[PDB]
């Protein structure tokens, strides 16, 4: 299993994989109980009022000031039972993802995707960037710095605003300069979205109540794909967008969708990014990887005593699949770069995960959500690692009946409808 331990929220802290920690948000915060579910991956069963100082409260703005697709409940994830279920739910989704070859490939890439040690201002020394770490309270009450790649945390004010958040640098664009940075994914396994089976209905903002429920494993996979791009520092600048001209409802409102999102969804959506810009990006990131190789070659000493320079150089050699010649020099091989870049951007996509999970899902990112449902995937009678909602040897096994909110209505409680509110 991906998660060797089936943690209980109330399990006693041990200062190793169950501990109170603080994150480098440049601000003050009380320690929060966190769980290390796998090498380099932690889960914090708390609403995220930490990564953004301006989002330190679950207080919702005005009463009509926010987007149609949003859901607020300041009380969500405030009790121990909720946090216990949140932990078990997130764990279950990681196992579901890991049970597929594609998921195993993606999670392996994420674990190997250690944020680059580019914190040194002296080119002859290799140093870590502290915002790619968390401070763990040890048994003696003292703090120890631990590098990590991923943190799954509860959502902020808007419960359904799932996204990757990461701490920036004063001058370096860590998610786009090849370096990478620790990713904090705001996510909840306790809610899901409703979509429509018909493409012309699903992509219309005035039609559909949301008959089918999105499998949350796909939703989490979507964020993990973004996390992968960001951990390898190859995320596409959000300023690069597709001026949607394939949906009149998007067009008439001048809606623009980032290439990063189209890439992440994959399938036909990825084709909206033309060859010219696609090649520009590839070359751009190829150069970024070359800089990493050059930086590694200049480093003659390592800062700290957590690892040897030799070990860290090998760590990044493996991460970026660099070539190490006779002179021990590192360089970027075009073929290896294209292979890794393509793996991270074309193999790991939402559309491909849908094929692996064998679930019904939106056919494009360019649609309109219909509703949001409260769900509970922890009970095996409701959802399993292997079949999601479509439980084998039951009436829910075929035709995605488990995802059919009308047939499997006991597994979904509609909280809000979005149709007509766009």
């Amino acid at each position: 299993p991906f998660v060797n331990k089936q943690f209980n929220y109330k399990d006693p802290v041990n200062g190793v994989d169950i501990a109170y920690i603080k994150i480098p948000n440049a601000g003050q915060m009380q320690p929060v109980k966190a769980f290390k579910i796998h090498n380099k991956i932690w889960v914090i069963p708390e609403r995220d009022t930490f990564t953004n100082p301006e989002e330190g409260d679950l207080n919702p703005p005005p009463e009509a000031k926010q987007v149609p697709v949003s859901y607020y409940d300041s009380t969500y994830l405030s009790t121990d039972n909720e946090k216990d279920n949140y932990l078990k739910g997130v764990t279950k989704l990681f196992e579901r993802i890991y049970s597929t070859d594609l998921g195993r490939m993606l999670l392996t890439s994420i674990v190997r995707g250690i944020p680059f040690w580019g914190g040194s201002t002296i080119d002859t020394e290799l140093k870590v960037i502290d915002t790619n770490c968390i401070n763990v309270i040890q048994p003696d009450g003292s703090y120890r710095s631990e590098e990590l790649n991923l943190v799954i945390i509860g959502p902020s004010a808007d419960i359904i605003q799932f996204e990757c958040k990461s701490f920036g640098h004063e001058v370096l664009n860590l998610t786009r300069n090849g370096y990478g940075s620790t990713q904090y994914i705001r996510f909840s396994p306790d809610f899901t979205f409703g979509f429509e089976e018909s493409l012309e209905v699903d992509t219309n903002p005035l039609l559909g109540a949301g008959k089918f429920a999105t499998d949350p494993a796909v939703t989490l996979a979507h964020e993990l794909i973004h996390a992968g791009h960001r951990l390898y520092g190859i995320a596409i600048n959000p300023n690069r967008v597709f001026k949607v001209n394939t949906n009149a409802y998007y067009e008439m409102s001048g809606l623009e969708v980032s290439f990063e999102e189209l890439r992440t969804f994959g399938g036909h959506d990825a084709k909206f990014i033309d060859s010219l810009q696609e090649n520009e990006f590839r070359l751009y990131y190829y150069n970024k990887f070359k800089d990493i190789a050059s930086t590694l070659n200049k480093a003659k000493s390592i800062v700290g005593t957590t690892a040897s320079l030799q070990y860290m150089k090998n760590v990044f050699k493996e991460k970026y699949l660099l070539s190490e010649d006779t002179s021990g020099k590192f360089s970027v091989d075009k073929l290896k770069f294209d292979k890794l870049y393509k793996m991270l951007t074309e193999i790991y996509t939402e559309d491909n995960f849908v094929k692996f999970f064998k679930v019904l899902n939106r056919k494009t990112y360019l649609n309109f959500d219909k509703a949001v449902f409260k769900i509970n995937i922890v009970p095996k009678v409701n959802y399993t690692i292997y079949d999601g909602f479509n439980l084998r040897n039951t009436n829910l096994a075929a035709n995605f009946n488990g995802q059919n909110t009308e047939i499997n209505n006991m597994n979904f409680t509609k909280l809000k409808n979005f149709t007509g509110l766009f």
Partner: peptide, 4 residues
């Protein structure tokens, strides 16, 4: 992130 999702859009619409």
């Amino acid at each position: 992130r999702r859009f619409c």
